[PDB]
Ligand binder design. Structure first.
Ligand SMILES: O[C@@H]1[C@@H](O)[C@H](O[C@@H]2CO[C@@H](O)[C@H](O)[C@H]2O)OC[C@H]1O
Length: 244
């Protein structure tokens, strides 16, 4: 078995009802809520309605195809856990106009009180977008990572779905000053974004645990659509290029 699959199994990822299985080759995911592995690649896939399909191969090539409608979908491939030193590489090939093409993940500290919205955090490092989340959050700071300027925001989700079920939680955002181009390799140096959030006191709770009720504290390269007004597709390839 691929090593991340073996590691996830040996740490009890099957405890989650929504975790499907290891698929050795490539699979199409269309259900409302699923996680799993295709090859060594973890995936998440979640929507509150509508129709959206994640096609993922064992080399990390993927496509999300969505149908127009009033719903929210987010999904994509990566890792069953966040690592603050990971360097995510990707190339995005096609984008009909997703709401976000974004690094996407969660942290969760079961020992923190749920009255503190920092006990559970959904985080985003946008790369392409047709919805601007700045309007929903407070500004943190601007910084440079891999030669480009990102700006941070913190928003709150009040009684909303999460990896721990309905919860009030913070979202941390990092948005670059320009859309990232298709057809070229890009890097997300995750440590720079973790650092930038921490620089304004926005601490990520633990990103390497299966303590939440519904899903791991995963980290993926995701396509998200909010109320898409047309059918669309978005496709790319993700990998780990962390210096090791
Ligand atoms: O893994 C799933 C999460 O992806 C989901 O989180 C919602 C996804 O859309 C985002 O815009 C929302 O802020 C967030 O509530 O929660 C359920 C979980 O199983």
């Amino acid at each position: 078995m691929p090593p991340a699959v073996a590691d996830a199994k040996a740490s009890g990822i099957a405890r989650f009802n929504a975790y499907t299985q290891y698929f050795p080759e490539a699979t199409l995911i269309t259900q409302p809520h699923a996680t799993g592995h295709v090859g060594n690649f973890f995936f998440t896939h979640w929507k509150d309605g509508g129709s959206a399909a994640l096609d993922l191969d064992a080399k990390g090539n993927f496509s999300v195809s969505w149908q127009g409608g009033g719903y929210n979908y987010v999904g994509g491939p990566g890792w069953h856990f966040g690592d603050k030193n990971r360097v995510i590489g990707y190339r995005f090939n096609q984008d009909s106009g997703a709401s976000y093409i974004t690094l996407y993940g969660w942290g969760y500290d079961k020992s923190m009180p749920a009255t503190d919205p920092a006990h559970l955090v959904e985080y985003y490092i946008l790369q392409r977008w047709t919805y601007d989340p700045s309007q929903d959050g407070i500004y943190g700071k601007t910084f440079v990572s891999n030669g480009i300027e990102y700006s941070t925001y913190r928003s709150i989700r009040k009684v909303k779905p999460s990896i721990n079920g309905p919860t009030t939680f913070y979202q941390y955002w990092s948005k670059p000053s320009a859309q990232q181009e298709l057809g070229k390799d890009h890097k997300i140096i995750f440590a720079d974004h973790v650092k930038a959030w921490a620089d304004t006191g926005w601490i990520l709770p633990d990103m390497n645990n299966f303590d939440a009720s519904d899903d791991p504290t995963y980290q993926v390269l995701a396509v998200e659509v909010f109320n898409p007004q047309k059918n669309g597709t978005a496709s790319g390839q993700v990998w780990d290029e962390t210096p090791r």
